[PDB]
């Protein structure tokens, strides 16, 4: 049987006339101010190797790559796979940003050692550029072999849409739901220009099953309660869906 593909995503419900949409982005970033708990969950989950001496890959569209501030990409301790139609041109720039990322990480390692910090094994940092999502799955598999840990599809809408259309193989969605806290007991909505490519089929479990908190906990390797948690002016919860 074939290894599962995990979509990880934070969404916000937007009621429309015809149906609730799930908003994920505005103007090339996220629709909401920084949610610390979502970012740390995202960081921990996508970094955490499924067995010792492996490194997880994140596969992402080029715009999502661009959405991270430049000094913070490629994202550390994971293999970053950037999907594009301009492999040639994006490669050169990714190479450039990787090498700067390398410089930062090296200085930090030297400093930590100099500080007497107990160094240990851990996943590596890489970035490679592929011409498609299938190509990226192949590429990362060929490059890393048995050092490859789990594979996440981390967005955005075009790559997610591609992930969901792959010819069957398990696909699971780890989703953080994000909602403004009510004011005078009405809940305002986030403006988004980018949406998760499906919505209703998840909320009404049509071809999808919402799984137990226990199941998600197993997927992501840390306790997930699936309870709402207050984070300033938003509340958030983590859930999972598997295709049926």
Ligand X SMILES: NC(=O)c1ccc[n+]([C@@H]2O[C@H](COP(=O)([O-])OP(=O)(O)OC[C@H]3O[C@@H](n4cnc5c(N)ncnc54)[C@H](OP(=O)(O)O)[C@@H]3O)[C@@H](O)[C@H]2O)c1
**Does 62 show up as a binding residue in the annotation?**
yes
**Does 85 show up as a binding residue in the annotation?**
yes
- Catalogue the E-assigned strands of the chain: 5-15, 20-25, 55-61, 79-83, 126-130, 148-155, 171-180, 194-195, 208-210, 229-231, 234-243
Is residue 158 near ligand X by the rule CB under 6 A? Answer: yes
Distance, in Å, from the CA atom of 152 to the CA atom of 60, rounded to the nearest integer, reads 9
Which is nearer to ligand X, 109 or 229 (by Cβ)? 229
Which is nearer to ligand H9G, 69 or 116 (by Cβ)? 69
Distance, in Å, from the CA atom of 156 to the CA atom of 27, rounded to the nearest integer, reads 13
What is the token pair recorded at 195?
């949406």
H or E element, residue 101: helix 87-114
Q: Residue 157 touches which of ligand X, ligand H9G, none (CB < 5 to 8 A by kind)? A: ligand X
Is residue 24 near ligand X by the rule CB under 6 A? Answer: yes
From candidates 58, 81, 157, 174, binder to ligand X by CB under 6 A: 157
Which is nearer to ligand H9G, 137 or 174 (by Cβ)? 174
Binding to ligand X by CB under 6 A, coded x per residue (else -) over 187-206, reads -------x------------
Is residue 61 near ligand X by the rule CB under 6 A? Answer: yes
Min. distance of Cβ 43 from ligand X in angstroms? 13
Q: Residue 63 touches which of ligand H9G, ligand X, none (CB < 5 to 8 A by kind)? A: ligand X
Which residues are CB-neighbours of 206 under 8 A, at least 6 positions away?
200
Is residue 84 near ligand X by the rule CB under 6 A? Answer: yes
**Contact at 8 Å (CB) between 104 and 43?**
no
Q: Which residue is nearest to ligand H9G (CB)?
A: 43
Distance, in Å, from the CA atom of 21 to the CA atom of 6, rounded to the nearest integer, reads 21
Distance, in Å, from the CA atom of 56 to the CA atom of 147, rounded to the nearest integer, reads 9
**Does 57 show up as a binding residue in the annotation?**
no
From candidates 5, 6, 7, 9, binder to ligand X by CB under 6 A: 9
Which is nearer to ligand X, 98 or 105 (by Cβ)? 98
Q: Residue 38 touches which of ligand X, ligand H9G, none (CB < 5 to 8 A by kind)? A: ligand H9G
Within 10 A of 94 (CB to CB), how many other CB atoms are there?
A: 22
| Cα dihedral 179, 240, 42, 171 sign | negative
178 phi, psi to nearest 5 deg? -125, 125
Residues of the binding site: 10, 24, 29, 62-64, 84-85, 156-159
Residues of the binding site for NADP(+): 10, 24, 29, 62-64, 84-85, 156-159
């Amino acid at each position: 049987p074939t290894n599962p593909l995990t979509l990880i995503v934070a969404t916000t419900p937007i009621p429309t006339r015809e149906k609730t949409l799930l908003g994920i982005g505005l103007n090339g970033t996220l629709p909401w101010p920084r949610i610390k708990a979502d970012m740390s969950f995202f960081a921990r989950v996508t970094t955490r190797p499924p067995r010792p001496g492996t490194t997880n890959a994140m596969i992402m569209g080029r715009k999502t790559y661009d959405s991270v501030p430049k000094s913070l990409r490629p994202l550390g301790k994971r293999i970053n796979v950037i999907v594009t139609r301009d492999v040639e041109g994006v490669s050169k720039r990714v190479a450039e940003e990787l090498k700067e990322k390398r410089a930062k990480m090296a200085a930090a390692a030297a400093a930590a050692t100099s500080a007497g910090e107990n160094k240990e094994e851990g996943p590596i940092t890489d970035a490679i550029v592929s011409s498609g999502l299938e190509a990226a799955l192949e590429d990362v598999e060929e490059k890393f072999k048995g050092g490859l840990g789990s594979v996440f599809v981390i967005g955005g809408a075009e790559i997610y849409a591609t992930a969901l259309g792959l010819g069957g193989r398990p696909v699971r969605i780890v989703m953080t739901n994000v909602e403004k806290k009510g004011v005078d007991g009405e809940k305002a909505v986030f403006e988004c220009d980018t949406f998760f490519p499906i919505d209703e089929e998840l909320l009404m479990e049509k071809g999808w099953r919402k799984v137990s908190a226990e199941e998600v906990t197993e997927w992501v390797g840390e306790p997930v309660s699936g309870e709402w948690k207050d984070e300033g002016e938003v509340r958030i919860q983590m859930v999972g869906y598997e295709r049926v």
